[PDB]
Design a protein around this ligand. Structure first.
Ligand code: 1LF
Ligand code: 1LF
Lengths: 312, 312
């Protein structure tokens, strides 16, 4: 891979790993991850005939990580990704996201369809903003997203996640059957790791060397930037409401994971109302950490879609 | 543009500026220049439908600049450029060079045709190595390349070129009719700038801001790395002789400049013997600094060739 750096603002520089030739495919990771979360996809997509740009998203890795909350609202993040394309001299790119990156790519497709050739999300569904319900009332109706309330107070989740980096990543990056964390009980317990092992075992999904890569990446900036993605609920809601009723008409793929107990497949059930020609993939025995849980399946699904529906 | 960095060896990292989408086109500058020497070509080639990778060559700018002479022999430089393609996941690229970069791209085409889609040189002709004549005897037969003897002794040309950076670049980067330097008299005079103005005027080719960009680039590493390109005559000759008699059969373009009084058009007259299907461009009223002297003409020639002969 090549390490690429794009200055989108005087103080904001975005880093990416680049491999391959062909149509541009921009990969956008989730929380709390890395370009490295795409390690299995990058060579496979390149081999398939694509130019891969695997991002360190704003706040992560070698990308800029300002402390200000407003720097991580979806409107700003998407605008920067447009400038990213501008600086690279790209008219369009395919955008593939997972988790928080999945949310970003949906809004890229929604607000900047002229710059998005095609869009794919792993796990993260597209649910249009509800102008009659505040972001807090949407959690008040969904006990599943309550852990995000714990992420609200600045400094709190930062301290817990940064206390022991190895423990953090070993505790998070696990297959569903290996889970040591209860996401539906976080805010009541006052932490992610209060009731989980002090020295967690290594998941079948990852090697020690892979965990240590994440550790080193988060030694650089910590979790403030990453957590700030959660702290713009009102701003993101207000921006999203400006696009009420509009449909996504560019080629689109939604990939669900059977064993993601937070981003459940059922959450995606109404997407066709807003994305008429949506295509779908579904991975059995797959938890939240899709790319590393089922890399072979992810590669198969993405390549099939890129070579067919995504082309015009 | 995007700033890209490719690690080709533990201690050698190559920098490039990247713009556009389409077939990969690698631009290789001369001495003593910069990726910035391609400033007029980068947007034009990108607009034409090409993915441009404008190098800082080894020894220059943001690329690694080790002090060792052997690090800059053509064999090593070319091998690194192959590894460069490998790291980027590129099977092939078009290679376009000027000056020392022109020499490099010819040897890329000669020794690695499977990795070079097409090859173009500005000013620098392809003359097969003569196994019956030492590199020194080739200068003894050509009073035009005598200035290169001044570049041989380590430290000497470094000191002169680094003494006053603004003076250096203002003295060098001039149209032929603005010349303040006598290249055929350098080694006898004991320097490039001994008889040239202390405070040279600004050439019509460049602005003050453009000169200052070069100044800042060479503040970083100086001229040792760049000058080391000249200090491998024997090594380069021995390597080149291994390819005696072999022809370049990939698409090829030679662009000559009427007023380059060192790399004269006539030097290229026999190239068809070794490159049967060579295509040609010729720029009138054009000195050594081709890209900045006649940017419109260079763009026209390169795009015409890239869109026709270079394709298969
Ligand atoms: C606008 N609200 C909204 N709505 C939906 C349907 N999704 C999302 N997002 C953003 C937040 C994101 C998230 O919290 N990731 C982290 C995480 C997901 C799962 C399991 C453990 C974890 C954790 F926290 F442990 F890393 C999940 C996708 N946001
Ligand atoms: C193997 N020998 C060989 N043979 C040929 C035909 N060309 C070359 N090269 C490499 C050296 C390169 C060079 O000296 N550039 C600098 C320069 C060129 C012009 C006018 C001023 C200057 C200078 F020195 F002022 F920058 C010219 C092309 N080498």
């Amino acid at each position: 891979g090549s390490h690429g750096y794009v200055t989108v603002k005087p103080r904001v520089r975005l880093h990416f790993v680049e491999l391959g030739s062909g149509p541009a495919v921009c990969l956008c990771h989730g929380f709390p991850e890395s370009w490295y979360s795409w390690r299995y996809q990058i060579p496979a997509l390149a081999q398939a005939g694509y130019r891969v740009l695997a991002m360190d998203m704003k706040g992560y890795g070698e990308s800029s990580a300002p402390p200000e909350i407003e720097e991580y609202c979806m409107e700003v993040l998407c605008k920067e990704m447009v400038t990213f394309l501008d600086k690279l001299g790209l008219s369009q790119a395919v955008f593939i996201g997972h988790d928080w990156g999945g949310m970003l790519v949906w809004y890229m497709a929604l607000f900047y369809p002229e710059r998005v050739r095609a869009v794919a999300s792993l796990n993260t569904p597209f649910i249009p903003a509800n102008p009659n319900m505040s972001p807090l009332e949407s959690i008040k109706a969904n006990p599943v997203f309550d852990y995000q309330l714990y992420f609200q107070e600045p400094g709190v989740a930062e301290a817990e996640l940064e206390q022991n980096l190895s423990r953090t990543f070993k505790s998070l990056f696990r297959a569903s059957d290996e889970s040591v964390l209860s996401m539906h009980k976080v805010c009541e317990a006052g932490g992610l790791f209060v009731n989980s092992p002090e020295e967690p075992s290594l998941s079948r999904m990852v090697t020690e060397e892979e965990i240590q890569f994440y550790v080193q990446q988060f030694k650089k900036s910590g979790f403030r930037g990453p957590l700030n993605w959660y702290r713009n609920m009102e701003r993101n809601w207000k921006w999203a409401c400006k696009s009420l009723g509009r449909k996504i008409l560019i080629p689109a793929l939604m990939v669900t994971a059977e064993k993601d107990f937070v981003l459940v497949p059922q959450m995606s059930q109404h997407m066709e109302d807003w994305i008429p020609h949506l295509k779908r993939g579904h991975i059995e025995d797959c938890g939240h950490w899709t790319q590393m849980d089922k890399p072979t399946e992810v590669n198969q699904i993405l390549i099939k879609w890129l070579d067919s529906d995504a082309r015009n």
